[PDB]
Structure formats: C-alpha cells, structure tokens
Amino acid sequence: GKALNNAIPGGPKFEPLYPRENEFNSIDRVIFRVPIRSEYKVAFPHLYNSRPRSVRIPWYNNPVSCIIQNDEEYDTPALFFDPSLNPIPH
C-alpha cells in the first residue's frame, strides 16, 4: 500500500515515494466490467496495476480454519460432537 500509493479502507496513508506523475488504455477500447477497486490492486499487485515498483508478494492464503471452541459450562467433555457440525449419514 505504501509502495503503490493506495489506501485499504481502515489502514494508514503515506507519501507516494514516486511523486512525479499514447492510446493504450483509452476509453473506446477497454471493456468496462467489474471495477478494479483498490483491494484487488493490493492483493495481486503485479496484475492489476502497471509499473509496480518496490512491491513484494503477499502470501496467497491459509486453508480454512475449523477450530471449535468449548467455553460453555465446562461440564461438556473435551471430545464432543458440536452442534455446528454436519452429520455423517449412511
């Protein structure tokens, strides 16, 4: 975000570090469809914006968590089939 000069909606705002600012991206020839809002330019930073200088590549994902907590009444055991879980039919 600092390198690209964008602002993700709840974080900090810096200076550009490249403050000096053809008919390739003209209006007639580009198909306007699904706007390229700033989260996409942060997430995939070599695809959505030209000239990424000083940009590093940010850890695609972690799989999906399904940790189940047990905080109610304590008298439930450690191993217990939670009401969140789907059944395993036959």
């Binding site: 905080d71 109610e72 009444e73 304590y74 008298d75």
Partner: peptide
Amino acid sequence: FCRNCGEAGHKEKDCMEKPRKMVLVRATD
C-alpha cells in the same frame, strides 16, 4: 452473552467480574 457474568449486555472480553473456571454514570454535561 457473557460466559461468566450471566448478564446479556456485553462480550466475554468485557465482563468486569474475574474470569472463572466454569450502576450510575456521570450524565453528559
């Protein structure tokens, strides 16, 4: 609601009682 207080207002991190194993306010002038 909160696990140890038993009141419905707040969250488990916000309960002012001590965590267990198992009110007048200044009017805004």
